[PDB]
Coordinates of C-alpha atoms and ligand atoms in Angstrom, one line a residue:
Chain A
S213 CA 108.0 80.4 86.8
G214 CA 108.9 83.9 85.6
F215 CA 111.5 86.3 86.8
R216 CA 110.7 90.0 87.5
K217 CA 112.3 93.0 89.1
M218 CA 110.2 92.5 92.3
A219 CA 110.0 95.1 95.0
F220 CA 108.9 94.5 98.6
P221 CA 105.3 95.4 99.5
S222 CA 105.5 99.0 100.4
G223 CA 102.6 99.4 102.9
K224 CA 104.8 99.3 106.0
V225 CA 106.9 102.3 104.6
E226 CA 103.9 104.2 103.2
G227 CA 102.6 104.5 106.8
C228 CA 105.8 106.4 107.7
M229 CA 105.9 109.0 104.9
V230 CA 105.4 112.6 105.8
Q231 CA 105.9 116.1 104.3
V232 CA 108.5 118.4 105.8
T233 CA 108.5 122.1 105.1
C234 CA 111.1 124.7 105.9
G235 CA 110.6 128.1 104.4
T236 CA 109.7 127.6 100.7
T237 CA 111.2 124.1 100.5
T238 CA 109.0 121.0 100.8
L239 CA 110.4 117.5 100.7
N240 CA 109.7 114.1 102.3
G241 CA 110.4 112.8 105.8
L242 CA 110.3 109.4 107.4
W243 CA 108.3 109.2 110.6
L244 CA 109.4 106.4 113.0
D245 CA 108.3 106.4 116.7
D246 CA 108.5 110.1 117.7
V247 CA 111.2 111.2 115.2
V248 CA 111.0 112.4 111.6
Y249 CA 114.1 111.9 109.5
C250 CA 114.8 114.1 106.4
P251 CA 117.7 115.5 104.4
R252 CA 119.4 118.4 106.2
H253 CA 119.4 120.4 103.0
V254 CA 115.8 121.2 103.6
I255 CA 117.1 124.2 105.6
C256 CA 119.1 125.6 102.6
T257 CA 118.1 128.7 100.7
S258 CA 119.1 129.8 97.2
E259 CA 122.4 131.2 98.7
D260 CA 123.2 128.0 100.6
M261 CA 123.7 125.6 97.7
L262 CA 127.4 125.8 97.1
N263 CA 128.9 126.2 100.5
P264 CA 126.2 125.8 103.2
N265 CA 127.3 125.9 106.8
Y266 CA 124.7 123.6 108.1
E267 CA 125.5 124.3 111.8
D268 CA 125.1 128.0 111.3
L269 CA 121.9 127.6 109.3
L270 CA 120.4 125.2 111.9
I271 CA 121.2 127.3 115.0
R272 CA 118.9 130.1 113.6
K273 CA 115.9 127.7 113.4
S274 CA 113.3 127.1 116.1
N275 CA 111.2 124.0 116.4
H276 CA 108.2 125.9 114.9
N277 CA 110.1 126.8 111.8
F278 CA 109.7 123.1 110.7
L279 CA 106.2 122.2 109.4
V280 CA 105.5 118.4 109.4
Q281 CA 102.3 117.2 107.8
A282 CA 101.3 113.5 108.1
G283 CA 98.4 113.0 105.8
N284 CA 96.0 115.8 106.7
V285 CA 97.4 116.2 110.3
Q286 CA 100.0 118.7 111.4
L287 CA 102.6 117.2 113.7
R288 CA 104.2 119.5 116.3
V289 CA 108.0 119.6 116.3
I290 CA 109.4 119.7 119.9
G291 CA 113.1 119.2 119.2
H292 CA 115.6 119.0 116.4
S293 CA 119.1 117.7 115.9
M294 CA 121.4 117.0 113.0
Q295 CA 123.3 113.7 112.6
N296 CA 125.7 113.9 109.7
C297 CA 123.5 114.8 106.6
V298 CA 120.1 114.0 108.1
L299 CA 118.0 116.2 110.3
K300 CA 116.0 114.4 113.1
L301 CA 112.9 116.3 114.1
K302 CA 111.4 115.2 117.4
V303 CA 107.6 115.4 117.2
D304 CA 104.9 115.3 119.9
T305 CA 103.3 112.0 118.5
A306 CA 104.7 108.6 118.1
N307 CA 103.8 107.2 114.7
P308 CA 101.1 104.6 115.4
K309 CA 101.9 102.7 112.2
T310 CA 105.6 102.4 113.0
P311 CA 106.7 98.9 111.8
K312 CA 109.4 96.8 113.2
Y313 CA 112.4 98.4 111.8
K314 CA 116.2 98.9 111.8
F315 CA 118.8 101.0 110.0
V316 CA 121.3 99.2 107.8
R317 CA 124.1 100.6 105.7
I318 CA 124.5 98.5 102.6
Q319 CA 127.5 97.6 100.4
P320 CA 127.7 98.1 96.6
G321 CA 125.8 95.4 94.7
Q322 CA 123.1 95.1 97.4
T323 CA 119.5 95.7 96.2
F324 CA 116.6 97.4 97.8
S325 CA 113.1 98.8 97.1
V326 CA 112.5 102.5 96.6
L327 CA 109.2 104.1 97.5
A328 CA 109.2 107.3 95.4
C329 CA 107.3 110.1 97.2
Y330 CA 106.3 113.7 96.6
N331 CA 104.8 116.0 99.2
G332 CA 104.8 113.1 101.6
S333 CA 102.6 110.9 99.5
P334 CA 104.0 107.8 97.8
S335 CA 103.9 107.6 94.0
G336 CA 105.4 104.3 93.1
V337 CA 107.7 101.5 94.1
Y338 CA 110.7 100.0 92.3
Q339 CA 113.9 98.0 92.8
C340 CA 117.3 99.6 92.8
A341 CA 120.9 98.4 93.4
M342 CA 123.8 100.2 95.0
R343 CA 126.1 100.6 92.1
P344 CA 129.9 99.9 92.5
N345 CA 130.3 103.7 92.2
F346 CA 127.9 104.3 95.1
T347 CA 125.2 105.8 93.0
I348 CA 121.8 104.4 92.2
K349 CA 119.9 104.4 88.9
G350 CA 116.6 105.6 90.2
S351 CA 113.6 107.5 88.9
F352 CA 113.3 110.7 90.9
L353 CA 111.9 114.2 90.0
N354 CA 112.1 117.4 91.9
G355 CA 110.4 117.0 95.2
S356 CA 111.5 113.4 95.7
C357 CA 114.2 114.1 98.2
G358 CA 113.7 112.2 101.5
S359 CA 112.2 109.2 99.7
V360 CA 113.7 106.1 101.2
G361 CA 115.0 102.7 100.2
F362 CA 114.4 99.5 102.2
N363 CA 114.3 95.8 102.4
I364 CA 111.8 93.7 104.4
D365 CA 112.6 90.5 106.3
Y366 CA 110.0 88.8 108.5
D367 CA 108.0 92.0 109.0
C368 CA 111.1 94.0 109.9
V369 CA 111.9 96.9 107.6
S370 CA 115.6 97.6 107.1
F371 CA 116.0 101.2 106.0
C372 CA 119.2 101.6 103.9
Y373 CA 118.8 104.7 101.8
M374 CA 117.5 108.3 101.9
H375 CA 117.4 110.3 98.6
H376 CA 119.3 113.5 98.6
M377 CA 120.3 114.6 95.0
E378 CA 120.6 113.9 91.3
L379 CA 124.1 114.0 89.8
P380 CA 124.7 115.5 86.3
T381 CA 124.7 112.1 84.5
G382 CA 121.1 111.5 85.7
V383 CA 122.0 109.0 88.5
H384 CA 121.2 109.5 92.2
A385 CA 123.0 109.9 95.5
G386 CA 121.9 109.7 99.1
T387 CA 122.7 108.6 102.6
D388 CA 122.0 105.8 105.0
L389 CA 119.5 106.7 107.8
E390 CA 122.4 107.8 110.0
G391 CA 123.0 110.5 107.4
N392 CA 126.3 109.2 106.0
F393 CA 126.5 109.5 102.3
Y394 CA 127.1 106.5 100.1
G395 CA 130.3 107.2 98.1
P396 CA 132.3 110.4 98.1
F397 CA 129.4 112.7 97.6
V398 CA 128.4 115.7 99.7
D399 CA 125.2 117.8 100.1
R400 CA 126.7 120.8 98.2
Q401 CA 125.9 121.9 94.7
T402 CA 129.6 122.1 93.7
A403 CA 130.8 120.1 90.7
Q404 CA 130.9 116.4 91.7
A405 CA 130.6 113.5 89.3
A406 CA 130.1 109.7 89.7
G407 CA 133.1 107.6 89.1
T408 CA 133.0 105.3 86.1
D409 CA 130.6 102.5 86.8
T410 CA 131.2 98.8 86.5
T411 CA 129.0 95.7 86.2
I412 CA 128.2 93.8 89.4
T413 CA 129.7 90.5 88.5
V414 CA 128.4 88.4 91.4
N415 CA 124.8 89.5 90.6
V416 CA 125.2 88.6 86.9
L417 CA 126.3 85.1 87.9
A418 CA 123.3 84.9 90.3
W419 CA 120.9 85.8 87.5
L420 CA 122.6 83.2 85.2
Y421 CA 121.9 80.7 87.9
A422 CA 118.3 82.0 88.0
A423 CA 118.0 81.3 84.3
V424 CA 119.2 77.7 84.8
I425 CA 116.7 77.2 87.6
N426 CA 113.9 78.4 85.4
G427 CA 115.0 76.0 82.7
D428 CA 117.4 77.6 80.3
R429 CA 120.9 76.2 79.7
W430 CA 121.8 77.4 76.2
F431 CA 124.7 79.7 77.4
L432 CA 126.7 77.1 79.3
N433 CA 129.8 75.6 77.8
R434 CA 132.2 72.7 78.4
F435 CA 134.9 74.9 79.9
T436 CA 136.0 76.1 83.3
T437 CA 138.3 78.9 84.4
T438 CA 140.5 79.8 87.3
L439 CA 139.3 82.7 89.4
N440 CA 142.3 84.9 88.5
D441 CA 141.9 84.2 84.7
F442 CA 138.2 85.0 85.0
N443 CA 138.9 88.3 86.7
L444 CA 141.6 89.2 84.2
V445 CA 139.0 88.7 81.4
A446 CA 136.0 90.3 83.1
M447 CA 137.8 93.6 84.0
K448 CA 138.4 94.1 80.3
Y449 CA 134.6 94.4 80.0
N450 CA 134.4 96.8 83.0
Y451 CA 133.1 94.0 85.3
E452 CA 133.8 94.2 89.0
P453 CA 136.4 91.7 90.4
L454 CA 134.9 88.5 91.7
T455 CA 136.2 87.6 95.1
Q456 CA 136.3 84.4 97.1
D457 CA 133.5 85.9 99.2
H458 CA 131.4 86.1 96.1
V459 CA 132.3 82.5 95.1
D460 CA 131.3 81.3 98.6
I461 CA 128.0 83.3 98.5
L462 CA 127.1 81.5 95.2
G463 CA 127.5 78.1 96.8
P464 CA 123.8 77.4 97.4
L465 CA 122.8 78.3 93.8
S466 CA 125.7 76.2 92.5
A467 CA 124.4 73.2 94.6
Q468 CA 120.8 73.6 93.5
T469 CA 121.7 73.7 89.8
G470 CA 124.8 71.4 89.8
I471 CA 126.9 74.0 88.0
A472 CA 130.2 74.8 89.7
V473 CA 130.8 78.6 90.3
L474 CA 133.9 78.7 88.2
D475 CA 132.1 76.8 85.4
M476 CA 129.4 79.5 85.4
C477 CA 132.3 82.0 85.4
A478 CA 133.4 80.3 82.1
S479 CA 129.9 80.7 80.7
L480 CA 129.9 84.4 81.6
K481 CA 133.3 84.8 79.9
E482 CA 131.9 83.3 76.7
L483 CA 128.8 85.5 76.9
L484 CA 131.0 88.6 77.1
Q485 CA 132.9 87.4 74.1
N486 CA 130.0 86.3 71.9
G487 CA 127.0 88.3 72.9
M488 CA 123.6 86.6 72.8
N489 CA 123.3 86.0 69.1
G490 CA 119.7 87.0 68.9
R491 CA 118.7 85.0 72.0
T492 CA 117.5 86.3 75.4
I493 CA 118.1 85.2 79.0
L494 CA 115.0 85.5 81.3
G495 CA 113.6 87.9 78.7
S496 CA 116.6 90.2 78.6
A497 CA 119.0 90.9 75.7
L498 CA 121.6 92.3 78.1
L499 CA 123.3 90.7 81.1
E500 CA 121.4 91.8 84.2
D501 CA 123.3 92.8 87.4
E502 CA 120.6 94.1 89.8
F503 CA 119.6 90.7 91.2
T504 CA 121.7 89.5 94.1
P505 CA 122.3 85.8 95.1
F506 CA 119.8 86.4 98.0
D507 CA 117.3 88.0 95.5
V508 CA 117.4 84.9 93.2
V509 CA 116.9 82.5 96.1
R510 CA 114.0 84.5 97.4
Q511 CA 112.2 84.7 94.0
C512 CA 113.1 81.5 92.3
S513 CA 111.7 78.0 92.9
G514 CA 113.9 75.8 95.1
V515 CA 113.4 73.1 92.4
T516 CA 115.4 73.4 89.2
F517 CA 113.4 72.9 85.9
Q518 CA 115.8 70.2 84.6
Chain B
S57 CA 115.5 112.0 85.8
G58 CA 115.4 108.3 85.3
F59 CA 112.9 105.8 84.1
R60 CA 112.0 102.6 85.9
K61 CA 109.4 99.9 85.7
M62 CA 107.4 101.1 88.7
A63 CA 104.5 99.6 90.6
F64 CA 101.8 101.4 92.5
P65 CA 102.3 101.6 96.3
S66 CA 100.7 98.3 97.5
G67 CA 99.7 99.2 101.0
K68 CA 96.0 99.6 100.3
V69 CA 95.9 96.1 98.8
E70 CA 98.2 94.5 101.5
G71 CA 95.4 95.3 104.1
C72 CA 93.0 93.1 102.1
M73 CA 95.0 89.9 101.6
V74 CA 94.0 86.8 103.6
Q75 CA 94.7 83.1 103.6
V76 CA 92.0 80.7 102.4
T77 CA 92.2 77.0 103.1
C78 CA 89.8 74.3 101.8
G79 CA 90.9 70.8 102.7
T80 CA 94.6 70.3 101.8
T81 CA 94.7 73.5 99.6
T82 CA 95.8 76.8 100.9
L83 CA 95.8 79.9 98.6
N84 CA 95.2 83.6 98.8
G85 CA 91.9 85.6 99.1
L86 CA 90.9 89.2 98.7
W87 CA 88.9 90.5 101.7
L88 CA 86.7 93.5 100.9
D89 CA 83.7 94.6 103.0
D90 CA 82.4 91.3 104.4
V91 CA 83.4 89.1 101.4
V92 CA 86.5 87.1 100.6
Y93 CA 87.2 86.5 96.9
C94 CA 89.4 83.6 95.7
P95 CA 89.7 81.2 92.7
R96 CA 86.9 78.7 92.7
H97 CA 89.5 76.0 92.0
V98 CA 90.3 76.1 95.8
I99 CA 87.6 73.5 96.3
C100 CA 89.2 70.9 93.9
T101 CA 91.3 67.9 94.6
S102 CA 93.9 67.0 92.0
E103 CA 91.5 64.4 90.6
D104 CA 88.6 66.9 90.6
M105 CA 90.7 69.3 88.5
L106 CA 90.9 66.8 85.6
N107 CA 87.3 67.6 84.9
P108 CA 85.6 69.6 87.7
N109 CA 81.8 70.1 88.1
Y110 CA 82.1 73.2 90.3
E111 CA 78.5 73.6 91.4
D112 CA 78.4 69.9 92.3
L113 CA 81.7 70.1 94.3
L114 CA 80.4 73.2 96.1
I115 CA 77.2 71.6 97.5
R116 CA 79.3 69.0 99.4
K117 CA 81.1 71.9 101.1
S118 CA 79.7 73.8 104.0
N119 CA 80.8 77.2 105.4
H120 CA 83.0 75.6 108.1
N121 CA 84.9 73.8 105.3
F122 CA 86.5 77.2 104.4
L123 CA 89.3 78.3 106.8
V124 CA 90.0 82.0 106.3
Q125 CA 92.8 83.6 108.2
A126 CA 93.5 87.4 108.3
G127 CA 97.0 87.6 109.7
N128 CA 96.7 85.8 113.1
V129 CA 92.9 86.1 113.3
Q130 CA 90.5 83.5 112.0
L131 CA 87.5 84.7 110.0
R132 CA 84.2 82.8 110.3
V133 CA 82.6 82.0 106.9
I134 CA 78.8 82.5 107.0
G135 CA 78.0 82.1 103.3
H136 CA 79.4 81.0 100.0
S137 CA 78.6 81.3 96.4
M138 CA 80.2 81.4 92.9
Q139 CA 80.4 84.1 90.4
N140 CA 81.9 82.7 87.2
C141 CA 85.4 81.4 88.2
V142 CA 85.6 83.2 91.6
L143 CA 84.3 81.9 94.9
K144 CA 82.7 84.6 97.2
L145 CA 83.0 83.7 100.9
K146 CA 80.7 85.8 103.0
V147 CA 82.3 86.4 106.4
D148 CA 81.0 87.8 109.7
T149 CA 83.3 90.8 109.9
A150 CA 83.8 93.6 107.3
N151 CA 87.4 94.4 106.6
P152 CA 88.1 97.6 108.5
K153 CA 91.0 98.2 106.1
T154 CA 88.8 98.1 103.0
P155 CA 89.9 100.8 100.6
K156 CA 87.8 102.7 98.2
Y157 CA 87.7 100.3 95.3
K158 CA 86.1 99.1 92.1
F159 CA 86.3 96.0 90.0
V160 CA 87.4 96.8 86.5
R161 CA 88.2 94.6 83.5
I162 CA 91.3 95.8 81.6
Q163 CA 92.2 95.7 77.9
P164 CA 95.2 94.0 76.4
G165 CA 98.1 96.4 76.4
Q166 CA 97.1 98.0 79.7
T167 CA 99.4 97.7 82.7
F168 CA 98.8 96.9 86.3
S169 CA 100.7 96.2 89.5
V170 CA 100.7 92.6 90.9
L171 CA 101.0 91.9 94.7
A172 CA 102.4 88.4 94.8
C173 CA 101.2 86.6 97.9
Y174 CA 101.7 83.2 99.6
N175 CA 99.7 81.9 102.6
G176 CA 97.9 85.2 102.7
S177 CA 101.2 87.1 103.2
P178 CA 102.3 89.6 100.6
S179 CA 105.8 88.9 99.3
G180 CA 106.5 91.2 96.4
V181 CA 105.1 93.8 94.0
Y182 CA 105.8 94.1 90.3
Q183 CA 104.4 95.8 87.2
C184 CA 102.7 93.6 84.5
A185 CA 101.0 94.2 81.2
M186 CA 98.0 92.3 79.9
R187 CA 99.6 90.8 76.8
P188 CA 97.7 90.8 73.4
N189 CA 97.4 87.0 73.9
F190 CA 95.7 87.6 77.3
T191 CA 98.5 86.1 79.4
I192 CA 100.7 88.0 81.7
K193 CA 104.5 87.5 82.0
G194 CA 104.3 87.2 85.8
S195 CA 106.5 85.7 88.5
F196 CA 104.6 83.1 90.5
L197 CA 105.3 79.9 92.4
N198 CA 102.9 77.4 93.8
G199 CA 100.8 78.9 96.5
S200 CA 100.4 82.2 94.5
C201 CA 96.8 81.6 93.3
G202 CA 94.5 84.4 94.5
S203 CA 97.2 87.1 94.2
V204 CA 95.7 90.2 92.6
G205 CA 96.5 92.9 90.1
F206 CA 95.4 96.5 90.4
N207 CA 95.8 100.1 89.5
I208 CA 95.2 103.1 91.8
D209 CA 93.5 106.4 90.8
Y210 CA 93.8 109.0 93.6
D211 CA 92.5 107.0 96.6
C212 CA 90.5 104.3 94.6
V213 CA 92.0 100.9 94.0
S214 CA 90.8 99.4 90.7
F215 CA 91.2 95.6 91.0
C216 CA 91.6 94.0 87.6
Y217 CA 93.2 90.6 88.0
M218 CA 93.2 87.5 90.1
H219 CA 95.8 84.8 89.6
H220 CA 94.6 81.3 88.7
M221 CA 97.2 79.3 86.8
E222 CA 100.5 79.0 85.0
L223 CA 100.6 77.8 81.3
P224 CA 103.3 75.4 80.0
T225 CA 105.5 78.3 78.6
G226 CA 105.7 79.8 82.1
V227 CA 103.4 82.7 81.5
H228 CA 100.3 83.2 83.6
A229 CA 96.5 83.3 83.3
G230 CA 93.7 84.6 85.5
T231 CA 90.4 86.4 85.8
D232 CA 89.0 89.7 86.5
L233 CA 87.4 90.1 90.0
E234 CA 84.0 89.1 88.6
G235 CA 85.6 85.7 87.7
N236 CA 85.8 86.2 83.9
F237 CA 89.0 84.8 82.4
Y238 CA 91.3 86.9 80.4
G239 CA 91.8 84.9 77.3
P240 CA 90.5 81.5 76.1
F241 CA 91.4 79.6 79.3
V242 CA 89.5 77.4 81.6
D243 CA 90.1 76.5 85.3
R244 CA 90.7 72.7 84.8
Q245 CA 93.8 70.5 84.3
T246 CA 93.5 70.1 80.5
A247 CA 95.8 70.9 77.5
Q248 CA 96.1 74.7 77.3
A249 CA 98.7 76.9 75.6
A250 CA 99.5 80.6 75.2
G251 CA 98.8 81.8 71.7
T252 CA 101.4 83.5 69.6
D253 CA 101.9 86.9 71.2
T254 CA 102.5 90.3 69.6
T255 CA 104.2 93.5 70.6
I256 CA 102.1 96.4 71.9
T257 CA 103.0 99.2 69.4
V258 CA 101.4 102.1 71.2
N259 CA 103.4 101.2 74.4
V260 CA 106.7 101.0 72.5
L261 CA 106.0 104.4 71.1
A262 CA 105.2 105.7 74.6
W263 CA 108.6 104.3 75.8
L264 CA 110.4 105.9 72.9
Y265 CA 108.9 109.2 74.1
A266 CA 110.0 108.4 77.6
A267 CA 113.6 107.9 76.3
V268 CA 113.5 111.3 74.5
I269 CA 112.3 113.0 77.6
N270 CA 115.2 111.4 79.4
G271 CA 117.8 112.5 76.8
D272 CA 118.1 109.3 74.7
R273 CA 117.6 110.7 71.2
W274 CA 119.9 108.8 68.8
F275 CA 117.1 107.0 67.1
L276 CA 115.3 110.2 66.0
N277 CA 115.5 111.0 62.3
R278 CA 114.2 113.5 59.7
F279 CA 111.5 111.3 58.3
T280 CA 107.8 110.8 58.9
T281 CA 105.2 108.4 57.6
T282 CA 101.5 107.6 57.4
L283 CA 99.4 105.3 59.5
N284 CA 98.8 103.0 56.6
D285 CA 102.4 102.7 55.6
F286 CA 103.5 102.1 59.2
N287 CA 100.9 99.5 59.9
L288 CA 102.2 97.5 57.0
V289 CA 105.6 97.5 58.8
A290 CA 104.0 96.7 62.1
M291 CA 102.2 93.6 60.8
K292 CA 105.4 92.5 59.1
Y293 CA 107.2 92.6 62.5
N294 CA 104.4 91.1 64.5
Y295 CA 103.4 94.4 66.1
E296 CA 99.8 95.3 66.9
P297 CA 98.2 97.7 64.4
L298 CA 98.4 101.3 65.4
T299 CA 95.1 103.1 65.2
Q300 CA 94.1 106.7 65.1
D301 CA 93.0 106.4 68.8
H302 CA 96.5 105.4 69.7
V303 CA 97.9 108.4 67.8
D304 CA 95.4 110.6 69.7
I305 CA 96.4 109.2 73.1
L306 CA 100.1 109.9 72.4
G307 CA 99.1 113.5 71.4
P308 CA 100.5 115.1 74.6
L309 CA 103.9 113.4 74.3
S310 CA 104.1 114.5 70.6
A311 CA 103.5 118.1 71.6
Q312 CA 105.9 118.0 74.6
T313 CA 108.8 116.6 72.6
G314 CA 108.2 118.0 69.1
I315 CA 108.2 114.4 67.6
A316 CA 104.8 113.7 66.0
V317 CA 103.6 110.2 66.4
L318 CA 104.1 109.4 62.7
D319 CA 107.5 111.1 63.1
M320 CA 108.3 108.7 65.9
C321 CA 106.7 105.9 63.9
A322 CA 109.4 106.6 61.3
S323 CA 112.0 106.1 64.1
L324 CA 110.3 102.8 65.1
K325 CA 110.1 101.7 61.5
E326 CA 113.8 102.2 61.1
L327 CA 114.6 100.4 64.4
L328 CA 112.5 97.4 63.3
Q329 CA 114.1 97.3 59.8
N330 CA 117.7 97.9 60.9
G331 CA 118.0 97.1 64.6
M332 CA 119.8 99.1 67.3
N333 CA 123.3 99.0 65.8
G334 CA 124.9 98.1 69.2
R335 CA 123.1 101.0 71.0
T336 CA 120.6 100.9 73.9
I337 CA 117.5 102.9 74.7
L338 CA 116.9 103.7 78.4
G339 CA 119.3 100.9 79.1
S340 CA 117.6 98.3 77.1
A341 CA 118.7 96.4 74.0
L342 CA 115.1 95.4 73.3
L343 CA 112.1 97.6 72.5
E344 CA 110.1 97.8 75.7
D345 CA 106.3 97.5 75.4
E346 CA 105.0 97.3 79.0
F347 CA 104.7 101.1 79.6
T348 CA 101.4 102.7 78.6
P349 CA 101.3 106.4 77.4
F350 CA 99.7 107.2 80.8
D351 CA 102.5 105.3 82.6
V352 CA 105.1 107.5 80.9
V353 CA 103.2 110.7 81.6
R354 CA 102.6 109.7 85.3
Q355 CA 106.3 108.8 85.9
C356 CA 107.6 111.9 84.1
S357 CA 105.2 114.1 86.1
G358 CA 105.2 112.7 89.7
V359 CA 101.6 111.8 90.4
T360 CA 101.1 110.5 93.9
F361 CA 98.5 108.4 95.9
Ligands
Y2C632 N1 115.7 118.0 91.1 C1 115.8 116.7 91.6 C2 116.0 116.4 93.0 CL1 116.0 117.8 94.1 C3 116.0 115.1 93.4 N2 116.0 114.1 92.5 C4 115.9 114.3 91.2 C5 115.8 115.6 90.7 CL2 115.6 115.9 89.0
Y2C633 N1 102.3 75.9 90.3 C1 102.0 77.3 90.0 C2 100.7 77.8 90.1 CL1 99.4 76.7 90.7 C3 100.5 79.1 89.8 N2 101.5 79.9 89.4 C4 102.7 79.5 89.3 C5 103.0 78.2 89.5 CL2 104.7 77.7 89.3
CL634 CL1 109.7 111.8 55.1
NA635 NA1 111.4 111.0 62.2

């Protein structure tokens, strides 16, 4: 029993974190095989924040302008290239702790673990979700750029996020490991702002299913809803639309608990209307939306506490 | 910016987890130097657990009755003994991934990271506090016994918890690595219950400081109070007493933010007496008590390992 924000064990990623220095800037890089990946803005100076021309900045750099430190060891850079907003530094040594890995670009609502690092050394690990507005609500200080987000499945690390910047509202923006930003953001210091965010409806439903599996039913009701009526209500609370894809994805949790998806939609509708009236769900007084259907199945018992 | 429930990086502990099997029971062990540590209840059948005599059950077992698997490799057990409620299996090979470590017993209110494991395979990491009632609000399924909790200081892993059981309310109980239980619990299938829990006041104050540092200031007010007056409010609301040591520990946060502890105690008193009035603090509608003062300082400073 229990239900926690649970991250993946971070050791496989810890073995890949290095420190990249260019001029006076130091940030983190990810060392896989003989390549170190890091945000391309490591090459910007004070004058390159608003309108950097990364091609012109990079052509002026030689391999030995990049200092890469893995633990106490200097790595020698023997090549460099830019791919979208990530810099790929070829180094003379393959990382002997390279795990089985892949690069995956995720969709809004997906979760992943973040290994926050500073000067190439990891500080902590926590769970994040890609918000509908393509930001993440992380915990990042200066020096954390190049920290990565990931999932682990059967000893294979799927890298899905690299940290690039903090927006004015205190939320965070970054790229996949191919250097393509999530959302409309760019690696420039011009005024940009996250769109209005919304609640991840399919995840809230997943977490309500988690609560039932762990033995709590107080929020259910005798009602159902059509999918369209549910969506008409939920968008009045700034909830994301629920699609037939989402209904299908919730099938397994519905079968395990015996609660039809649209019946749990009816429970959510009433929860938005009523609040919790001094009660909690899985220890929270708010509706939680950073557990996916897959997250719930991976953490919860396959046997409902009836 | 940002404030998240954050665990220590778990790599140093992952390299120590092994699978321990005795008869039909598989659970997790901690492999350090040439010893594997696991719950002594690994040797019990279901019937044994109704009333186990552990020394008696252990005599019947021989070294080859303990199957220990590190990843894909078997470890040969060459000795076995008990220390309190943990079994110590001496093996032929020292763990080459043994970190610098110590065994430490923590105090209620202190936090630690839990590496949840099944069949010797780490599955997840999360942050826990030792509750005042000596339980932890963990997330564990069957097969999780022997999963461990820890803190890291520089390069040194301080192991503080080994998982042994789940109580009927779904919270969890275990031992330190010397096998001493946290709380009034025993490793046998008998009637046991979590006692009434309380809220960890110094941690709530720490988290309020975290909120101020992150720009969440609506609950600040012009008032202050005294330790004696506040502790009357704390006891009324089932909060732990605040001591002068707690005030001293929060000293740095009071200096950094300009809210003295008794100044912040006045904010907390008002939150206890009136509620949150529809507002949230660091995205919570509840007052969070599983961040210590050091947790807040570490995460708002960027200390690494
Ligand atoms: N200054 C930063 C950077 Cl560069 C990245 N993440 C967070 C902050 Cl506050
Ligand atoms: N059955 C258990 C055990 Cl033995 C330990 N932790 C949690 C659970 Cl649900
Ligand atoms: Cl006053
Ligand atoms: Na005050």
